[PDB]
């Protein structure tokens, strides 16, 4: 019940840290019960990721183990949430990772949340800024969501800043709206504007709120 | 163990570990000790004279500081997984035990090579990426399916082989049967046709589909009470079977 | 030569922690000391080393160690105990001609790799169970008697069609895949034709464009619809005979 709810983050983190593939059914069971929407899944995943990050920092688990956990989460996600891309759409959006990073689960969750509220969505894990710009132009998409890697280190922040700057430095993407997450979105809001992003989502589950703000202005 | 000369001591350490680093109290790499019997790491001498922190990732810097700052002589640290940056910008992991040496408070780092594990990790990440790229292709195809089915003037109904219930259809089929979409989705297909029952109907359509140059089946729709003709086809989707029925007026 | 002087107990502990298993073996072949989840191995001390090696490994150890001299380098040999394999690096110590065997267990790396391989296989199999929409799309398009052609708005080329459309256009399906759609119709050009289609689709008028198909020489009526499909911009043409 709500007892189950209170225990979900701890139970999931344990399962993911020990035998994620062998106990994948239990992982799925917990997420089925406590993640009725992709936004709920995002809240639970991000909480677990903080715990896994700390465990890795204290050497209680290895990067290999985090990799197994992440694969199991991806499998669990696809057993539960897989919305059609909406045909009656409020707009088009592209979710991308930063070159040199693989936010596969985070980008998938971003796409689920955006599809759930009516956005026609595509997802790209681009090789470069140029390749991403090409995809934006071909799909005629003017809104870009940069998916953060919750289980990768702080080098991604400077990488994302260089990424956003590089995008803004171009002249072939006029009017592009850019949303960023992770640590960059957690700064005081005044700092956010300098980076070149139009809005930040401080947690993955706050992405719809951020997109709604950008779409308004 | 008997009495040991310094050169021999160095060689024993260098060959007991897969790789070992001697780092000054200040944090400068003093020596990279190669095990010649272990797969090469390439030239790492360039690390010598440079701060250890130059060759570690940010989380590994913090982890090194965490396990070394309070580390006193007498016992090794807990094992620490550190991620290195190679001179050629290669990134590789080593699991180290740290020892504080009492004579000069240097830290000797005794390593186990994790490169083979990292290689297989990269294969798994690549497969995760490939699966999600294919997932997105399926989403394109699902929209194509939706549009083709809905726009098609050819009346079509899709039925689950397992339950015998309608799983999809288009408006053209709905109009012939005499029902709206939401009422027909989930409905037992046999009960849409007068005189039919699930067992015999499903078996009849399944056998008929499995023949060549089959004739359409005459049915009488329960709702519209219109005489219709049905042509069944059977295919496998996601492990289970679907029955696709094309429906035409008999008159 | 940067290491400071190291006390003997420390040297022992550095070796013990760096290696997975180390054996000090007397000149005469007796295990003097074992330093190591391996099992106790306490019983090995005081026993001849050959008693704890397979016969193949006895032969290998004897060959690699007989010519091994102090201060003349070290030698690596893979040995199996009475079975499990260990990479041993052998040094002969000068004080007493004992042999120090520095062992690396490569089983853990192997098992960790197997975990990752099995995870990959399981993940790939999970996605195998959800590839249904491409199949549904193919079957519905193929079975449908309503003539339809799907065109990439990005490239202006046919991406798919059914046999009913093929008949009207005048070629088999496989020959029309990839064809520029405007060039199938006499007097049409890519730019102006796509504009015509896009404009009509937005009007939702569905009042058809009259074309003459090049291959079949049939006059046709084309009704366009435009849609987005997970990042792909597509044009669907429904086709009917005109004359």
Automatic annotation (TrEMBL), chain A:
Signal peptide extent? none
Source domain of life is Bacteria
**Could you tell me what this protein is called?**
AppA protein
The species this protein belongs to is Cereibacter sphaeroides (Rhodobacter sphaeroides)
Gene transcribed to yield this protein = appA
TrEMBL record, chain B:
Where does the secretion signal sit in this chain?
none
Q: Outline the extent of the PAS domain.
A: 141-193
Molecular function GO terms recorded: identical protein binding; sequence-specific DNA binding
**What name appears for this protein in its UniProt entry?**
Transcriptional regulator, PpsR
Gene giving rise to this polypeptide: ppsR
Q: Which span of the parent protein is shown here?
A: 7 to 257 of 464
């Amino acid at each position: 019940g709500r007892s189950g709810r209170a225990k979900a983050v701890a139970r999931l983190s344990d399962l993911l840290s020990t035998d994620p593939l062998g106990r994948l059914t239990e992982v799925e069971e917990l997420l089925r019960a406590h993640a009725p929407t992709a936004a709920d899944f995002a809240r639970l995943f991000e909480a677990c990721a903080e715990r896994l990050t700390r465990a890795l920092a204290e050497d209680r688990i290895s990067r290999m183990q985090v990799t197994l956990a992440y694969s199991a989460l991806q499998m669990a996600l696809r057993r539960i949430h897989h919305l059609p891309d909406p045909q009656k759409s409020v707009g088009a959006v592209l979710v991308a990772g930063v070159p040199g990073h693989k936010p596969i689960l985070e980008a998938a969750l971003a796409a689920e949340m955006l599809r759930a509220v009516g956005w026609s969505t595509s997802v790209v894990h681009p090789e470069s800024v140029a390749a991403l710009a090409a995809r934006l132009k071909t799909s005629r998409t003017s809104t870009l969501v940069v998916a953060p890697s919750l289980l990768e280190g702080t080098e991604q922040e400077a990488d994302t800043l260089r990424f956003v700057s590089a995008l803004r430095a171009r002249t072939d993407l006029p009017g592009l709206s850019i949303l960023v997450g992770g640590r960059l979105a957690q700064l005081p809001p005044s700092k956010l504007k300098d980076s070149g992003a139009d809005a930040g989502f401080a947690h993955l589950a706050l992405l719809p709120a951020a997109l709604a703000r950008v779409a308004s202005s | 163990l008997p009495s040991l000369a310094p050169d021999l001591v160095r060689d024993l350490i260098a060959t007991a570990a897969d790789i070992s680093l001697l780092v000054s109290q200040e944090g400068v790499v003093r020596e990279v000790m190669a095990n010649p019997h272990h797969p090469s790491f390439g030239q790492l001498s360039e690390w010598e004279g440079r701060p250890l922190e130059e060759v570690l990732t940010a989380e590994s810097v913090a982890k090194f500081r965490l396990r070394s700052e309070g580390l006193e002589p007498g016992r090794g640290s807990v094992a620490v997984e550190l991620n290195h940056i190679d001179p050629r910008s290669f990134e590789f992991p080593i699991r180290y035990i740290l020892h504080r040496l009492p004579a000069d408070r240097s830290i000797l780092m005794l390593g186990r090579d994790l490169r083979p594990i990292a290689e297989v990790q990269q294969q798994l990440v690549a497969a995760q990426l490939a699966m999600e790229r294919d997932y997105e292709t399926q989403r394109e195809m699902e929209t194509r399916y939706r549009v083709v089915l809905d726009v098609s003037r050819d009346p079509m109904v899709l039925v689950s082989m397992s339950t015998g219930r309608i799983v999809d259809l288009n408006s053209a089929a709905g109009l012939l049967l005499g029902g709206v979409r939401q009422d027909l989705l989930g409905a037992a297909i046999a009960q849409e046709f007068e005189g039919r029952r699930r067992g015999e109907f499903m078996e009849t359509m399944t056998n008929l589909a499995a023949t060549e140059s089959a004739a359409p089946v005459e049915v009488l729709a329960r709702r519209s009470q219109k005489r219709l003709l049905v042509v069944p086809r059977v295919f496998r989707a996601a492990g289970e079977r679907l029955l696709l029925c094309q429906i035409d007026p008999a008159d």
